[PDB]
Amino acid sequence: STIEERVKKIIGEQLGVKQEEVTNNASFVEDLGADSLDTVELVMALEEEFDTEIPDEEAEKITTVQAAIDYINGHQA
Amino acid sequence: STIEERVKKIIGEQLGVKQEEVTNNASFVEDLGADSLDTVELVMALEEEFDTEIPDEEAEKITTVQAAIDYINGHQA
Amino acid sequence: VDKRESYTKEDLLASGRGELFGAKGPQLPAPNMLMMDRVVKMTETGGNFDKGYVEAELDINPDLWFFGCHFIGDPVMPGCLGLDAMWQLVGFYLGWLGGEGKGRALGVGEVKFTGQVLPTAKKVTYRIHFKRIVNRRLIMGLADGEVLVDGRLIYTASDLKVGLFQ
Amino acid sequence: KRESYTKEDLLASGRGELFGAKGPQLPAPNMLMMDRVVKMTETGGNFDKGYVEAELDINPDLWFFGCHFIGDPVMPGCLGLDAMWQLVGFYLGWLGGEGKGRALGVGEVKFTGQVLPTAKKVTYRIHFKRIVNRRLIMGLADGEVLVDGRLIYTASDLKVGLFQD
Numbered sequence: 001s002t003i004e005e006r007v008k009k010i011i012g013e014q015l016g017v018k019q020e021e022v023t024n025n026a027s028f029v030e031d032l033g034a035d036s037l038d039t040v041e042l043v044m045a046l047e048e049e050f051d052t053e054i055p056d057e058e059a060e061k062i063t064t065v066q067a068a069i070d071y072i073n074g075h076q077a
Numbered sequence: 078s079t080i081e082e083r084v085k086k087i088i089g090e091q092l093g094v095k096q097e098e099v100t101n102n103a104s105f106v107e108d109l110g111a112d113s114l115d116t117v118e119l120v121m122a123l124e125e126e127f128d129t130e131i132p133d134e135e136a137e138k139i140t141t142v143q144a145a146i147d148y149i150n151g152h153q154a
Numbered sequence: 155v156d157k158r159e160s161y162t163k164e165d166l167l168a169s170g171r172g173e174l175f176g177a178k179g180p181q182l183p184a185p186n187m188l189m190m191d192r193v194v195k196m197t198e199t200g201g202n203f204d205k206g207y208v209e210a211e212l213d214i215n216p217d218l219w220f221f222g223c224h225f226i227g228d229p230v231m232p233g234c235l236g237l238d239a240m241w242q243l244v245g246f247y248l249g250w251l252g253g254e255g256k257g258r259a260l261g262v263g264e265v266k267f268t269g270q271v272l273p274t275a276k277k278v279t280y281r282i283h284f285k286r287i288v289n290r291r292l293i294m295g296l297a298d299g300e301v302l303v304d305g306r307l308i309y310t311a312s313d314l315k316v317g318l319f320q
Numbered sequence: 321k322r323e324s325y326t327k328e329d330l331l332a333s334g335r336g337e338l339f340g341a342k343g344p345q346l347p348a349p350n351m352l353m354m355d356r357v358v359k360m361t362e363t364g365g366n367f368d369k370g371y372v373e374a375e376l377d378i379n380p381d382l383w384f385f386g387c388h389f390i391g392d393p394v395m396p397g398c399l400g401l402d403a404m405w406q407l408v409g410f411y412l413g414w415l416g417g418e419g420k421g422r423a424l425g426v427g428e429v430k431f432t433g434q435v436l437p438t439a440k441k442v443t444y445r446i447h448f449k450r451i452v453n454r455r456l457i458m459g460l461a462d463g464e465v466l467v468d469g470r471l472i473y474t475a476s477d478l479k480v481g482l483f484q485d
């Protein structure tokens with residue numbers, strides 16, 4: 001599962017938080033310090049790294065680390 | 078590729094010309110239209126492509142396609 | 155908002171008052187930060203990525219305020235104001251599409267200034283090529299831009315980013 | 321040479337009266353985007369190749385707040401970016417460089433917070449990476465903009481040059 005760890009790497013970089021803080025059920029907005037901008041850039045960073053376009057309202061539902069992981073899994077296989 | 082062709086490519090894109098223009102005798106400013114910014118950027122692009130540092134006093138003498146080639150082949154080809 | 159494909163200076167001054175795209179739409183800056191006199195073309199498709207295009211102009215006159223101070227005895231149009239025009243135009247476009255919120259520049263990738271605008275010039279032209287519009291809690295536009303003076307390309311900006319926020 | 325400059329020194333710079341007759345000028349008001357230069361060193365900064373720190377006091381009477389935007393005042397990001405270009409250029413002059421200043425570009429700029437008229441002070445930090453002394457004298461640097469101690473803008477690879485004729 002390179003997926004789960006690679007996604008945690010991207011989230012950590014984009015939201016500028018520590019490796020320790022990127023737990024699986026952590027909320028980008030509530031738990032991490034993410035605003036509306038960090039969130040857009042986050043999803044766009046996932047699109048760029050893994051080569052997958054997903055419309056804006058497939059996103060706005062990816063709110064946590066589990067969601068991002070879960071979502072990209074299905075689109076990678 | 079050869080040192081000669083990599084140097085020519087960098088010169089080409091940096092100065093906005095394709096290879097048939099980049100002749101060994103071609104002078105950056107007299108023949109290829111470079112200004113003071115283009116020449117600074119060109120030599121820096123050379124430093125980066127060939128992973129070498131060129132001092133300003135040296136850079137100042139790189140004014141033709143052949144001089145860039147000779148410089149790179151001489152340090153340390 | 156009823157899309158038109160071009161806008162006059164009066165339309166742009168109305169935009170600065172909040173009276174062009176309705177109160178909830180973004181505003182342009184008013185003078186002296188407004189950096190265009192008109193928008194001459196706006197399309198939903200077209201541009202280098204076929205995802206949208208805007209073209210705008212600014213008339214050049216030696217009495218423009220910035221020539222007097224940047225610099226004393228050496229007038230030139232500040233590059234930062236050309237870049238602001240491009241951010242202004244991205245935000246304006248988001249409004250034109252119907253986006254609501256306050257406009258904010260978010261950043262830019264590479265900017266290159268290779269020539270200058272002198273007070274003897276006639277006209278500066280801005281071209282914006284849209285790459286992506288994100289319609290989320292934040293509305294964001296991503297574009298490349300070009301600035302020309304009298305037909306001559308002088309500035310480029312990759313990955314201009316502007317958003318509308320609530 | 322001095323390592324810090326007052327408002328009066330920066331106004332002198334805009335009249336071409338601080339460095340040499342041949343040194344670069346800062347912009348005059350209303351394009352001058354600092355009130356003071358607090359520190360300037362040849363070493364130090366994140367790359368140990370030069371550092372500048374400067375400040376701008378924030379007051380609701382500043383011209384740009386009235387027009388950008390009416391009903392929603394905020395300091396234009398482009399003007400904070402111009403302060404960074406101004407400081408890179410000022411630094412080249414400070415080292416004794418001759419010619420007219422010109423911004424050349426920047427690599428990437430991110431704006432993650434804003435300056436409201438209720439803020440007290442904006443701080444600019446410039447970290448030099450490289451100076452090229454050729455017919456064009458060019459400085460390359462990273463910049464940071466902070467408001468009341470919080471980082472809000474970053475710029476990588478600010479480029480400014482001093483040119484003749």
Ligand SMILES: *C(CCCCCCC)CS(O)(O)CCCNC(=O)CCNC(=O)[C@H](O)C(C)(C)COP(*)(=O)O
Binds near residue numbers: 231234480
């Ligand atoms: C004001 C801000 C500059 C801050 C410098 C302060 C130092 C005191 C003037 S602008 O820089 O904003 C002018 C607009 C942007 N840049 C330009 O117009 C210059 C673009 N580049 C060129 O024209 C060429 O590269 C030049 C002439 C510089 C090459 O020189 P060379 O051939 O001798």
Ligand SMILES: *[C@@H](CCCCCCC)CS(O)(O)CCCNC(=O)CCNC(=O)[C@H](O)C(C)(C)COP(*)(=O)O
Binds near residue numbers: 182246319388398434
């Ligand atoms: C005005 C010129 C821009 C004109 C473009 C709009 C025309 C309609 C001044 S600036 O936009 O440049 C102010 C520059 C500083 N940048 C900002 O203030 C926004 C920076 N980003 C943020 O503050 C966050 O990303 C926020 C919190 C606003 C994200 O919002 P989100 O949680 O919904």
